[PDB]
Symmetry: D2
Subunit: 1038 residues, 4 copies
């Protein structure tokens, strides 16, 4: 007799037609004048300076006209007047419309509102476009005259919508500002209106009741009671009588006061608004987005108590402080009260896989320093909601930095596998454990809807041990943030039947409570996940925009060399002055460039062009600084011999780690011989290797002497180039699909020349495809076990993937790759669907593949992505077995950048025949070390020699104080127990050494092992006991 | 009492709306109670009963219906037996009801 | 090992972008 | 690393997923080897087949560093097919090899 569906339809129609219009009824019309800036954005301070000095026209503007260009800015002067004695106990807000698209938010035009003084009030957004004007008793945010006349300013930014309802469409509107109306929008509304809270409350109640009915478990008393309440409320509401809206609200009060279920989970909600530093917009728009988001958060705090907001990136904090001092001061006062929570303590939300360990340490150090010296807040956890996987060395770095918990939600984007836990302990390759929580809502920007809460409840993977989940609500990935509607919905959900108990809580308190509850309930049976947090998505981010990865690795290596040289020079010449400010600026620029959208290479062409310019400038400046330091060291050391061409690479074999070694050092081995075969085949034979090259320039025989091992399986060619068709359905730049594989097309070349420059044989190979030329130099050096490859590629393809095949002829179940501070093992043979999802992994400067009695290594210069597959042959033809290891070189996406990686690229790699962990580390260090000139052969400042085990001294630097102490960071690379003894330069006679943390804070947790017993000792003769991937840090004081 | 508690927990799990916190909490409580019970030690049956007490003390839902129960025993005057057996069945039923009233307070029985 | 939903999404994208435009390719412009 | 009929097999010690947890009781063939990159130790058994291995994560605040708990299954007492199963005298032999490789483990297994 009662049909709930008809009631739902009637409720939706009534809300659309008779309830929502009565909210914000317009009472006055505004007059608009405009001033356009087609070019770069105009800073507010000098804009207001000339504005009060004149110089601005403000041509009149009519409602419904088109105003914006592709990237320009428009300043609107809005002049209005209030009626005579109108504000009779109502807020009397102000409504502005800029032509919002209903099915879009955070990806197109926006704006900010300013007073005549020059202080921002609140930003405007498609779902939040109301600005507070007056208060009930008459207090106004802007000065108002006796006549009621008032004026305001509106800075509107028009940005193209690069993500429409047809997703991933190629565009050319992401390069620069053209100053032309590519897609103008209409203005059509600027009104002064009154505010009625009763109608808004009724709308919220109706929406909550309808959404509860949508998941009310039909054929239950709750569903029918909600339906009856909705019907009665709709029947009792009369549009002609304004007071009836009160009585209708009294009908829904009975069903909205029901207490929550006893077993319902407890949800803590914190205001969040994810802002990408550079994604579909340059940094200049990122700063404005940060300012608008902070203004919106401050307005929400002013208009609503019991509201808390969390902000993460320190670079955005610095930008806001430098751009808007008044907003920064208001935010600081809010922070002192405890309502504005800074989280993360990092410069930016960097990627978890590509950056080196030192890069992550610099993230943490700079973020913590800024937070301590400018906000007085010390975060207790890592805030990385969005990241394309994590290296697995994160728990040790975070634990040694004083952090206590980790946050992540990207793992929910896996293709096939569901992570077994949401709240657990993440354990690194070393043994350090941290408390990690995955928000079950699977999003960092919640709209505060019942369906989100229900999905989060049904998605939790630890219901048997905990009932605590964290909700992050607001508008993200484009700015904005939480709105008033979200707070009202949360207040409704605070205690409701069928909805979890939601309360606003600081994340630290939530993490403490959840950890304590998990410890109580679980005990011995407490979840632990050991290893890396691999993400089964966005696998193409390891190859896209190769310039980013190349520049990052080169800058890291050059920075290591520069800091070592500076530390050496300071301890020798007291008159030398360390350039701390310039080095800090370069470090901060690199850290900003290490964002989770720039380093992967999934932004617009403008962002990548700026990043390339920054990389080139920083590399040149670092080279000049290194040259100056080298000159100073040469001046201070006249006894040493100059090296015309030398490199300094950490962990050089034969106990000569931090010594500068020449490029071409004389060897007892004779010059390598060359020979031409009958059919153009080239034979190269030094004393240890035999390489045979076919007429197409591909290696077919790689024989290792004194072992009787063939490194190339029969029937396979080494060095062959493969082209794949890369046409993914979604996320063109992010994704490389499984269907792309298994259809690679071979590209053939030929041998051009054979030469012998300094006793090393070089073979030149040209490969052509049509407007794409690859020139490859294959080098064999006497007295070495490594075969070198250099490649120059003129990439001009479109939607194609380039790979190189390196067969190894070794049957291995797993392959060993390098980590940030250790090693990882990944399966080669994929038996299950979970293993198949890891068909494209990352390498860090080398990979090792070997059986019980033999192993071979592949060393790469600046290549990250790769893959490995088995090769099962048959004896009936000649193919025995092996492992096909391929490296990803180039790709050509089209969506974010129409022309991606089109131009000249350089690659270097090598194959090591008889390789161990030490030899692989040696080859990786030598290849990646920067080349410098005219360096003295000076004794290293510190040395670490291991009697047993492998210990690598990763870094030496100066303490970031005036003390001048020496910081040495080392780690265990082999993976087992190791013993070492520390040695220092004769200049550091009588110096003392003591253990610190990664931040040099002298405070370390008791749980973590120290690896430096007896506490403080002397620098010379100190004993160290490294566990597996220990990552010790020492401080030496003269 | 332990048998009744175990039966109630199992029957609740049978219709506990899987993928909800209540179902998993009931499962964990049942597992812990079964693990804590030792047949060799008679006193352990007490401790196991203390494990299920947490999930059995949860209050009912706010919208749950209110059910009133009355003792009943339908007796047909003549169906598959003559009246002479009907009288004996009536006597036995009344005796059982009286015994239940004696052995248990807060019990009511209705006869027609 | 085979995900039909990914195949459906890829098919829809391919039809939208690479197949439908090739139907009725314009060869001449008209004056109005 | 455990011994196979004509080779060796590798089984996970750290169980991350539910699939890995299902292998909580494996079989050994006359020996097992557990070792890191630079060291290894072997457990040789006479006639024992079932065994298991688990991690040992300690804390430096007490003294427990780390390790691997390797346990061997010796005897069980089922009741359904045989009311008195394995009731009586049994003999077992095993050994621990400190510095062990594949050759040394094979040697110890063959000799024993
Ligand atoms: O997942 C792709 C995309 O997702 C969100 O929009 C943001 O976190 C971006 O930074 C990211 O690139
Ligand atoms: Zn992001
Ligand atoms: Zn009857």
């Amino acid at each position: 007799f009662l049909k709930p569906e008809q009631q739902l339809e009637r409720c939706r129609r009534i809300v659309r037609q008779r309830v929502d219009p009565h909210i914000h009824p317009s009472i006055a019309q505004l007059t608009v004048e405009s001033y356009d800036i087609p070019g770069e954005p105009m800073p507010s301070d000098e804009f207001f300076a000339k504005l009060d000095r004149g110089d601005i026209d403000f041509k009149p503007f009519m409602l419904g006209s088109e105003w914006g260009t592709t990237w320009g800015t428009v300043w609107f002067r809005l002049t209005g007047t209030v009626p005579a004695g109108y504000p009779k106990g109502k807020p009397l807000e102000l409504i502005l419309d800029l032509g919002w698209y209903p099915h879009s938010c955070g990806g197109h035009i926006e704006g900010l509102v300013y007073r005549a003084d020059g202080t921002a009030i609140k930003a405007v957004h498609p779902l939040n476009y109301w600005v507070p004007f007056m208060d009930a008793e008459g207090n106004a945010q802007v000065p108002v005259a006796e006549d009621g006349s008032f004026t305001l300013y509106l800075e509107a930014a028009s940005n193209p919508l690069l993500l429409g309802v047809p997703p991933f469409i190629e565009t050319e509107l992401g390069d620069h500002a053209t100053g032309k109306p590519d897609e103008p929008y209409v203005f059509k509304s600027a009104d002064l209106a009154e505010f009625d809270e009763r109608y808004e409350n009724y709308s919220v109640d109706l929406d909550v009741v309808s959404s509860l009915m949508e998941f009310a478990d039909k054929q239950s008393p709750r569903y029918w009671q909600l339906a009856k309440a909705l019907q009665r409320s709709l029947n009792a509401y009369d549009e002609r009588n304004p007071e009836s809206v009160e009585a209708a609200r009294a009908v829904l009060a009975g069903v909205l006061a029901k207490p929550a279920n006893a077993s319902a989970m407890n949800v803590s909600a914190i205001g969040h608004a994810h802002i990408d530093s550079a994604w579909l917009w340059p940094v200049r728009e990122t700063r404005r987005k940060v300012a608008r988001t902070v203004s919106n958060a401050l307005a929400l705090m002013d208009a609503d108590p019991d509201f808390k907001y969390a902000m993460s990136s320190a670079q955005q904090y610095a930008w806001l402080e430098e751009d808007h001092p008044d907003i920064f001061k208001r935010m600081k006062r809010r922070i002192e009260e405890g309502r504005f929570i800074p989280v993360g303590g990092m410069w930016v939300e960097a990627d978890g896989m590509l950056p080196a360990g030192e890069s992550l340490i610099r993230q943490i150090a700079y973020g913590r320093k800024y937070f301590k010296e400018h906000l007085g807040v010390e975060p207790k956890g890592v805030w990385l909601p969005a990241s394309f996987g994590y290296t697995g060395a994160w728990p040790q770095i975070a634990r040694r930095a004083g952090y206590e918990w980790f946050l992540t939600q990207k793992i929910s984007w896996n293709d096939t596998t569901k992570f077994p836990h949401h709240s657990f302990m993440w354990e690194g390759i070393d043994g350090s454990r941290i408390f990690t929580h995955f928000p079950p809502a699977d999003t960092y920007a919640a709209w505060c809807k019942v369906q989100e809460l229900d999905y989060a409840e049904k998605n939790f993977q630890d219901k048997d041990l905990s009932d605590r989940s964290l909700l992050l609500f607001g508008f993200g990935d484009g700015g904005g943030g939480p709105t008033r509607n979200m707070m009202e919905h949360l207040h409704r959900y605070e205690n409701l039947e069928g909805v979890s108990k939601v309360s606003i809580e600081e994340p630290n308190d939530f993490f403490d409570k959840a950890h304590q509850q998990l410890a109580e309930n679980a005990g011995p049976e407490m979840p632990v996940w050991k290893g890396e947090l691999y993400l089964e998505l966005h696998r193409g981010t390891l190859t896209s925009q190769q310039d980013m990865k190349r520049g990052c690795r080169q800058e890291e290596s050059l920075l290591r060399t520069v800091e070592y040289l500076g530390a050496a020079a300071v301890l020798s010449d007291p008159e030398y002055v360390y350039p701390r400010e310039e080095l800090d600026r370069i470090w901060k620029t690199l850290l900003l460039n290490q964002f989770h959208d720039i380093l992967p290479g999934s932004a617009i062409a403008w962002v990548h062009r700026e990043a390339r310019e920054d990389y080139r400038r920083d590399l040149k400046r670092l080279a000049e600084i290194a040259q100056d330091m080298c000159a100073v060291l040469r001046k201070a050391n006249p006894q040493a011999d100059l090296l015309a061409e030398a490199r300094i690479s950490q962990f050089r074999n034969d106990g000569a780690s931090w010594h500068a070694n020449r490029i071409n050092e004389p060897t007892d081995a004779l010059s390598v011989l060359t020979q031409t075969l009958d059919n153009g085949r080239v034979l190269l034979a030094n004393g240890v290797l035999s390489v045979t090259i076919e007429a197409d320039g591909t290696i077919s025989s790689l024989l290792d002497e004194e072992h009787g091992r063939e490194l190339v399986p029969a029937g396979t060619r080494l060095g062959q180039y493969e082209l794949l068709r890369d046409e993914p359905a979604v996320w063109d730049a992010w994704e490389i699909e499984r269907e792309s594989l298994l259809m690679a097309n071979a590209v053939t070349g030929s041998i051009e020349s054979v030469n012998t420059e300094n006793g090393a044989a070089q073979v030149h190979v040209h490969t052509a495809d049509g407007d794409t030329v690859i020139t490859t130099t294959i080098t064999l050096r006497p007295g070495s076990h490594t075969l070198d490859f250099h490649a120059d590629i003129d990439w001009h393809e479109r939607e194609r993937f380039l790979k190189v095949d390196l067969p190894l002829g070794i049957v291995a179940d797993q392959a060993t790759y390098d980590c940030q501070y250790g090693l990882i093992r990944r399966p080669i043979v994929k038996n299950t669907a979970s293993d198949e999802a890891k068909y494209e992994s990352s390498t860090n400067r080398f990979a090792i593949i070997g059986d019980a009695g033999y192993a071979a290594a592949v060393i790469n210069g600046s290549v990250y992505g790769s893959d490995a597959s088995p090769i099962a042959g048959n004896a009936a033809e000649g193919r025995d077995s092996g492992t096909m290891f391929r490296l990803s070189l180039l790709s050509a996406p089209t969506f974010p950048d129409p022309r991606t990686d089109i131009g000249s690229h350089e690659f270097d790699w090598s194959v090591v025949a008889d390789a161990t962990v030490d030899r692989a580390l040696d080859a990786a260090g030598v290849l990646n070390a920067p080349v410098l000139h005219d360096v003295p052969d000076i004794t290293p400042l510190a040395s670490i020699e291991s009697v047993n085990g492998t210990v690598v001294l990763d870094w030496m630097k100066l303490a970031d104080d005036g003390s001048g102490d020496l910081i040495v960071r080392a780690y265990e690379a082999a993976g087992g127990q190791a013993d070492a003894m520390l040695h220092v330069c004769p200049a550091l006679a009588g110096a003392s050494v003591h253990e610190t943390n990664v931040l040099e804070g002298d405070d370390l947790a008791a749980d973590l092992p120290v690896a430096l017993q007896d506490g403080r000792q002397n620098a010379e003769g100190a004993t160290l006991h490294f566990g597996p991937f220990q990552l010790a840090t020492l401080r030496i004081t003269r």
